[PDB]
Symmetry: C2
Subunit: 135 residues, 2 copies
């Protein structure tokens, strides 16, 4: 497929995985899950679990964390680098900005997707490996 559409989905994936807002948690969780390989769905879920203090649910509890994409680059046929910053805002007036870099192992799979799951993952974008580190 096009590079623009792959960038489109890599951006989305990183925003949904690394951002957080209570109102959008169920949608973001489901978006990330649908764009993840079964093995990756599982790591993501253990990480997002409410009992993990490093879950976005917890570290951004009562906060809003927005991801701004800086750049997206292909290191390889199936390897994307996404540089971004998180802007985090509390119940008060206080912004902390921090910079991060994510690596996605990805591909597209012709599989079965229900008519409605295709309104989220129309092309079978699948992230098989993922990592986020600060800069």
């Amino acid at each position: 497929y096009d590079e623009a559409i792959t960038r489109y989905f890599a951006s989305q994936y990183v925003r949904a995985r690394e951002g957080f807002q209570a109102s959008e948690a169920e949608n973001n969780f489901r978006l990330v899950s649908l764009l993840s390989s079964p093995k990756e769905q599982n790591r993501f879920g253990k990480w997002y679990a409410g009992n993990n203090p490093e879950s976005p649910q917890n570290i951004y509890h009562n906060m809003i964390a927005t991801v701004t994409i800086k750049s997206i680059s292909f290191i390889s046929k199936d390897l994307i680098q996404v540089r971004y910053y998180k802007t985090v805002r509390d119940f008060n007036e206080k912004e902390n900005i921090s910079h991060w870099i994510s690596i996605l192992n990805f591909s597209y799979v012709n599989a079965h997707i229900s008519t409605s799951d295709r309104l989220i993952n129309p092309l079978g974008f699948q992230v098989s490996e993922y990592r986020s580190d600060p800069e």
Copy 2:
């Protein structure tokens, strides 16, 4: 382009235009604007304006309005029908569900889109005419 990607964007457009949540207003407004022809951007803006009591800002002030897509159908090469329901929830515990049908006149345009506007409208999806009516 694919039907799945066109459905993908028609769904998105209708969710962003007909839904409402304060936290996501700026993003939704910008998404709808970017996927609209200049003439349609303008009608949408006069409609969304804070002084219009029929703006989503006002009719769903302090509420959350979520769009669930029922179906998407092509009536023609450039004419989509999107049937959906709005579920509206107040500060209390009270849900009103209502059913609606939207008509989109659409196309794709090879134009200039900045690298970052392409993380929202990667393919130049443009809605030239639009209307939403109850069922």
